[PDB]
């Protein structure tokens, strides 16, 4: 077995960045905050909350969500978000949600791509 570590140091996964259409959709949608880092800015679930509120004003209210770094508040935001997603019919994958709350590299990117597909006319992300 051959290893690629620096004496056991495994470099971070270094996932590819978001697609330009996804970034443009997020920027065009009016948000108080900005996507600086996908992982950091989506882990709390507040930005996803604002996106869901913009697409569904009555269903998602900003006051139900809290901009906190805690696991408890993050889980509350993401669980009410998943409840609304299931009630509406939107497919919000639980594995991606958990990777996003735990800050797993690429989980928030994939989640944002999934939401951009669910909302922005299913404009399939240009892959390969």
């Amino acid at each position: 077995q051959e290893d690629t570590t620096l004496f056991g140091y495994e470099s971070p996964p270094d996932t590819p960045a978001l697609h330009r259409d996804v970034l443009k959709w997020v920027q065009g949608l009016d948000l108080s905050q900005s996507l600086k880092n996908c992982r950091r800015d989506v882990a709390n679930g507040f930005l996803v909350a604002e996106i869901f509120s913009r697409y569904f004003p009555a269903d998602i209210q900003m006051h139900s969500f809290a901009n906190a770094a805690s696991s408890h508040f993050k889980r509350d935001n993401w669980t009410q978000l998943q409840a609304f997603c299931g009630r509406q019919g939107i497919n919000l994958p639980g594995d991606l949600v958990e990777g996003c709350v735990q800050g797993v590299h690429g989980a928030a990117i994939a989640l944002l791509e999934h939401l951009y597909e669910a909302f922005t006319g299913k404009k399939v992300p240009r892959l390969k």
Binding site: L6, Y9, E10, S11, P12, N67, A68, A69
Partner: protein, 431 residues
């Protein structure tokens, strides 16, 4: 009626805050049980700046103590003024951050930050009018630096207009305590540049130098260094608490000190620091205070102002003194040392006068200098950070807490850009 919310972070921050509250309580005549025993109207006149009145005559500091290990605030509560603080304001975890900025900022700092912000909001809403928050902590430590930067970001988000004051103990140049001080300092400076409105730099070795050379103490413990820090921290805000012939609050000092938003790092010093033997031989005069004030030995920062150029400098004097005397002294200093002062600002000194001197001292003066000398401090910290980061030593501790390697490079780039701006204004020429 302009309140200040004090926050202490980490072991060093908590010890400094405890010493500061002891000094302020002594200055206002407050015993460790909370009762006032000062016999002076002015002491109770503006006690609401730092304290709140309980059901009785007790006064509770508007202080919030942060840590991930309970031992430090157990020591704080065992300290001389451990009983003034409200027991609810002690926010502690169970496992401390092992000198890990990632642990104190993302993993373990995330859960306790709820309680920290809850207590901060509870204290802030009770304030009639809020001047701002002041956080005392040490760069180069896990819980201190990490939780402090996270809290400062949160407070900047919640209260953008309110003033933000930071007393950060930057790692010392020559003798370093912990190995990962350059990582923690680099990661903390990036947050402080973006979030902190006003930030002051302290170095343990610089404080050792000043207490060995000026005070001529033989065995200075951490208590003496915290005593000097407490003196500076009180003297910066004495204008809020006492009548002044030319008073100047924290926002006024920040306005007259900060030329550009990113250049908000300051070196501070306190006068008069006199050795016990030479107390009789030294004569307390405004020129003597200014002479000690502008001496590079008086700075509590390692960087000496001689290498850099004074962009700005505020001087808060306390005691019965002549405004003409003070102003002429500052102008004479500027003219004599015009080489060390930036040309494209006609007057580089913000002079303030307060009528209430610290107890026992007939006069005093605190100095807050914005100079491009701090550039060399940031440069040295970057020199250590790059040396460690090239071989990625101790990087796995930060990586295992869920921190991207890209964040280290981002922080280093921000720190280097700050250095570049300092150099640009050091060598900027008029017209």
């Amino acid at each position: 009626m302009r309140e200040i919310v004090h926050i202490q972070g980490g072991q060093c921050g908590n010890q400094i805050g405890a010493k500061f509250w002891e000094v302020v309580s002594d200055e206002h005549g407050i015993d460790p049980t909370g009762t006032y025993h000062g016999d002076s109207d002015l002491q109770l006149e503006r006690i609401n700046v730092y304290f709140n009145e309980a059901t009785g005559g007790r006064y509770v500091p508007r202080a919030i103590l942060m840590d991930l290990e309970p031992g430090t605030m157990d020591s704080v509560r065992s300290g001389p003024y451990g009983q003034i603080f409200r027991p609810d304001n002690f926010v502690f975890g169970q496992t401390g951050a092992g000198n890990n900025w990632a642990k104190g900022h993302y993993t373990e700092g995330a859960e306790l930050i709820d309680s920290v912000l809850d207590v901060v909001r509870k204290e802030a809403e009770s304030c009639d009018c809020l001047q701002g928050f002041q956080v005392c902590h040490s760069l180069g430590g896990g819980t201190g630096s990490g939780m402090g930067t996270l809290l400062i970001s949160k407070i900047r988000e919640e209260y953008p207009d309110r003033m933000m004051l930071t007393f950060s103990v930057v790692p010392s140049p020559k003798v370093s305590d912990t190995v990962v001080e350059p990582y923690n300092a680099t990661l903390s400076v990036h947050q402080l540049v973006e979030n902190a409105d006003e930030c002051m730099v302290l170095d343990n070795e610089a404080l050792y130098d000043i207490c060995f050379r000026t005070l001529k103490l033989t065995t200075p413990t951490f208590g003496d260094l915290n005593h000097l820090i407490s003196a500076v921290m009180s003297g910066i805000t004495c204008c809020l608490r006492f009548p002044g012939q030319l008073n100047a609050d924290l926002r006024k000092l920040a306005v007259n000190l900060i030329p550009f938003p990113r250049l908000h790092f300051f070196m501070v010093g306190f006068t008069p620091l006199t050795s016990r033997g030479s107390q009789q031989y030294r004569a307390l005069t405004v020129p003597e205070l200014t002479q000690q004030m502008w001496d590079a030995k008086n700075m509590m920062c390692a960087a000496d102002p001689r290498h850099g150029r004074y962009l700005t400098a505020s001087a808060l004097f306390r005691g019965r003194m002549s405004t003409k005397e003070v102003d002429e002294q500052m102008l004479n200093v500027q003219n004599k040392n015009s080489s060390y002062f930036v040309e494209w600002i006609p007057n580089n000194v913000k002079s303030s006068v307060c009528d209430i001197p610290p107890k026992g001292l007939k006069m005093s003066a605190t100095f807050i200098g914005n100079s491009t000398a701090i550039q060399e401090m940031f440069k040295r910290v970057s020199e250590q950070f790059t040396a460690m980061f090239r071989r990625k030593a101790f990087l796995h501790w930060y990586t295992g807490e869920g921190m991207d390697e890209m964040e280290f490079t981002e922080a280093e780039s921000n720190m280097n850009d700050l250095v570049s701006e300092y150099q640009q204004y050091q060598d900027a020429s008029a017209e």
